Amino acid sequence: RKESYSVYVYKVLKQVHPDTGISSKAMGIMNSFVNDIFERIAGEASRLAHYNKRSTITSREIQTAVRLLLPGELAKHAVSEGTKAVTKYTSS
Template identity: 80%
Template sequence: MAPKAEKKPSTAEEDQQQEEKKLSSPAPSPAEKKPAKAEKRLPAVTKEGSGLIEKKKKKMKKINETYKIYIFKVLKQVHPDIGISSKAMGIMNSFINDIFEKLAQESSRLARYNKKPTITSREIQTSVRLVLPGELAKHAVSEGVYGYENNRVINEVRI
């Protein structure tokens, strides 16, 4: 372990300069040392030449996930010559979000009823039958089973 450095005896001039520094800048009170975390801060303002320039904080861009791209792709597969307005696209996006939310709630409820911790494809299939009406449920289940089997076969080939 290294020995501690010894303090040099200070001269009277150095002591006087230190006291003047202390007197010229008053010690901030404890409340002024740290600003409260909830305190709102104004943007920094700097003087450049004759005018004032404000520094602005960059805003974080909120990531907004939608199904608009996929809705448009399906529309072009079914009716290539038809377009869709932005208002109608917003309505379709809300519709898909609502359906997915209903399916998730129903699947969760089924898993809870059966005291299972995991939502499997069986719960999803049953919730589709319960949420969607008649013929629409039959088509959705058949397409879902086809997609599930197709995905399973592809994953088995990789292994």
């Protein structure tokens, strides 16, 4: 009945730091982190489509929201990653 992001956080952790664990209090913080950024990005993407009279949210709205929210080099790398993901999703 309850759902979370813990599985995927654990995978990513074993992918960057294979020797390192994580406590239960900390994964709550990480789950809260993921829920917050989702809400922010989707909220900005909702408005851009309303401002421009669009009824559909696409990857362009998410990209623009990423540019607006995230600071500096972090936005640059996030844009690169998302673009690659879409690129190799389409080519399958």
